[PDB]
């Protein structure tokens, strides 16, 4: 008789009817396939036969229906067994009057990617689709600090406080780049762009980075991600990307561990009776981020969710269990164009949780589902997980790296004080001042006149107009 | 021997240490000597005599102490020891590093004015002063419903949607209006000034109540509050009143009963062993707004709590009790001008439930106290309460009298579509519009310039401008 055990060798089942069993049962088939081709000397050539692909997946299937393997998974029995309760208990919190709503959720550990638990959907005798593993939804927002914010501060070309133009713009097809209703404001810092998940200063950070020819696909690829197209303008808004939770959960991982990628996995070993290892988890670990780029970014997302602007979460949490709520949270949130889709994702330095709701034939939900709804089943689904294991999400804070160096900026610039070129007169740029976080090794620029990232002539004449009135 | 009774007839004590009895016992004895000097034939003339005054003040004490009194009050058993158990367990939570934070509380039954239950402070037997009944603080912007926009619209002198100037204003001594570190922005309606809570708007209208003569203090004073000078600029801001809570929550029960004031009272009936009726309360119920007045007001503060801007409550109660957080609540927020008081006054159809919170000393509380501790606080209380007596709260929904009324108007004007006057070209005046709620007979006027609630010249110039440009 095979079984799947948890981590710690408890039996999951014997080779029953929920998302544990056949995600687990499905991965361990996968790596019984990858075993027995190479044991029977089947070259990667003949493996792209389809005939011997069939072939040697069922015999994968039937190889541990009948023999006597021993399978660990990643998967914390407390954990997993309080996150299903939380969605039987708590799921029907996500309902915002658009029909049923879907979700799935992965609990991940930052220092290995184990994936500890997690809620493959609402109640699987009713609907089986896994949406922790198997289905691929826009992540929208939540690209932004991945894509665009990381990377740009990571090739040195921001800091925490840099100033980004949020002006009125279109896309090439001279459309207006919308968020929400609102088409734009002005000039803004770093901050305010992520507090609120502006898309303009998404948008002109990955200009930027094609200007400048940025290897942005091996950043993405490093952590595991496929896109099969970089030439895309709303790519930082989660355009052109379709991901797992699974996946993308690995990827604010990956800024949660000081910027070092550990493979997702759920299977961590596979045994036959005698012992012989069949398949073994091999970690590689990988510096995508600088330390001091995830760990200026880390300090980003705590206020994102502090703030409060687009989730309710911390609220929601500090009610439920406030000294859970006082440890040290970061997090993004993300909605699709037609309220479609909304993510959060959530870290402490010792796990991070992704979460994703929406409907499987992709309609429309609320206009609050994300901010409020998600938000509160989230807070309960943490709460769930600390009662059941009170150490796991730790009490440990983030903290900027050593590498991390500080400028003094002015406030308005984003920049340093200098002098300045604006028709005609060329002004001492005077102000009030703040502490802005570099990744690179020279930290803030002197300002100069296009301080912004983005922005029309137009826009830099009212900029410079008001700032200059401001002296 | 004396008994205090809770309202069903359980006895309290006999004539122990904490606020109930204090409380309970003080405002019988304020009974009893009443009933004592007329008893005695004391003329109110012989009565101003402070000796005489003494002596009856000690013959009522022990009149209680030694007789057979039996004195109803209207304190709900239940309902009172939750609230205790809720401060003694959930009273930490206020603190947010200015020292330890003092709390009152008080609940009321919006048709009766009986206070079914309160919180007098953190813990009696640290701090005795009663915070619900004897401490008398501003009660900052939750003065702005009752005596700002409230009689406003009571004048029909404006509706639901009508614009306010929040341009940058001084008071008469030169100084800057502040709302927090901001010195204000634009025109807004009448939601965004109460969700928000900003101070220009409030200035503006009880600045034209002045204008047109309005009787304020009839208002104010049919519901209790003893107000010196009517005469002061930031009175709508709270400036020139103290209030205790219970007096405070009577004014919000005003608002939530459709406008029918009921006194508040702690005691219900003092019988003689015998029989006798020594005191009773008579009820005097007063139409202090209209039926129109008080809905329309309702409905407004209802998004100052959805809205979340100045108060976390909801999100709070959402997780703690979504059933409950789903019963229809009003509210308003107060912030003294260091930090130094926060009120969160709520209301479901059926109670209101008045609370303060700060420094017996008068010093500042940290700037997010209101914000996110009281509500979160009141937030357990409420939960307290609810699981206490699971009815008490009620269902029903608040909705709109029949007698209000409702026009059309432009969103840009919160007026009626017209013709108007800006310097040359007089304008057709086109754009969307929404349908806004006034509580006189003719409804929303037909637009004109001066157009909103209070603004100078320049005010009104850009306003415009900004306007037309949008045609
Ligand atoms: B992001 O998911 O926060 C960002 C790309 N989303 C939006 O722009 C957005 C909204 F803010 C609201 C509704 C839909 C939508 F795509
Ligand atoms: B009101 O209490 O909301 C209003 C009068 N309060 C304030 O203007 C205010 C703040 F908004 C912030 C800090 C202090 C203060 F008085
Ligand atoms: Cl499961
Ligand atoms: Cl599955
Ligand atoms: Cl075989
Ligand atoms: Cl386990
Ligand atoms: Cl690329
Ligand atoms: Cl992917
Ligand atoms: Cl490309
Ligand atoms: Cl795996
Ligand atoms: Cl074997
Ligand atoms: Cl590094
Ligand atoms: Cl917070
Ligand atoms: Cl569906
Ligand atoms: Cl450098
Ligand atoms: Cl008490
Ligand atoms: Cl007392
Ligand atoms: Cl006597
Ligand atoms: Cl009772
Ligand atoms: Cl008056
Ligand atoms: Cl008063
Ligand atoms: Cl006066
Ligand atoms: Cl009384
Ligand atoms: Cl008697
Ligand atoms: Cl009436
Ligand atoms: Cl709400
Ligand atoms: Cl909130
Ligand atoms: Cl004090
Ligand atoms: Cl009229
Ligand atoms: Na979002
Ligand atoms: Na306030």
Known sequence: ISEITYSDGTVIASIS????????????????????????????????????????????????????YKITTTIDQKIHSAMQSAVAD???????????????????????????????????????????????????????????????????????????????????????????????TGMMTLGEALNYSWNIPAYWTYRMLRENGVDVKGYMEKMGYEIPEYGIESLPMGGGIEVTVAQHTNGYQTLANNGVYHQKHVISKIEAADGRVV?????????????????????????????????????????????????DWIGKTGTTGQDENMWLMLSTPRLTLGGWIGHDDNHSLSQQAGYSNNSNYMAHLVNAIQQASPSIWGNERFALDPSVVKSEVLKSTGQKPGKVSVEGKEVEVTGSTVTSYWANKSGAPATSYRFAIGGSDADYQNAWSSIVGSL
């Open 17 to 68: 009817r929920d998302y544990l069993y056949f995600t687990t049962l499905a991965e361990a088939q996968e790596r019984m396939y990858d075993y027995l081709a190479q044991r029977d000397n089947v070259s990667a050539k003949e493996l792209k036969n389809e005939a011997t692909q069939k072939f040697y997946r069922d015999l994968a299937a039937k190889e541990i229906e009948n023999g006597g």
């Open 90 to 184: 708590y799921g029907y919190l996500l309902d915002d009057g658009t029909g049923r709503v879907e979700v799935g959720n992965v609990l991940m550990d930052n220092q290995t990617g184990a994936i500890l638990g997690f809620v493959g959907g609402r109640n699987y005798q009713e609907n089986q689709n896994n949406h922790a593993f198997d289905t691929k939804r826009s992540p929208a927002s939540t690209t932004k600090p991945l894509l665009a914010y990381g990377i740009a501060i990571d090739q040195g070309l921001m800091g925490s406080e840099t100033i980004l133009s949020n002006y009125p713009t279109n896309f090439a097809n001279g459309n207006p780049i919308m968020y929400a209703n609102s088409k734009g």
């Open 279 to 327: 398949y073994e988890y091999q970690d590689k670990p990988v510096q995508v981020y600088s330390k001091a780029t995830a760990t200026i970014m880390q300090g980003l997302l705590r206020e994102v969710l502090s703030s409060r602007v687009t989730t309710t979460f911390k609220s929601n949490l500090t009610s439920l269990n406030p000294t859970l709520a006082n440890a």
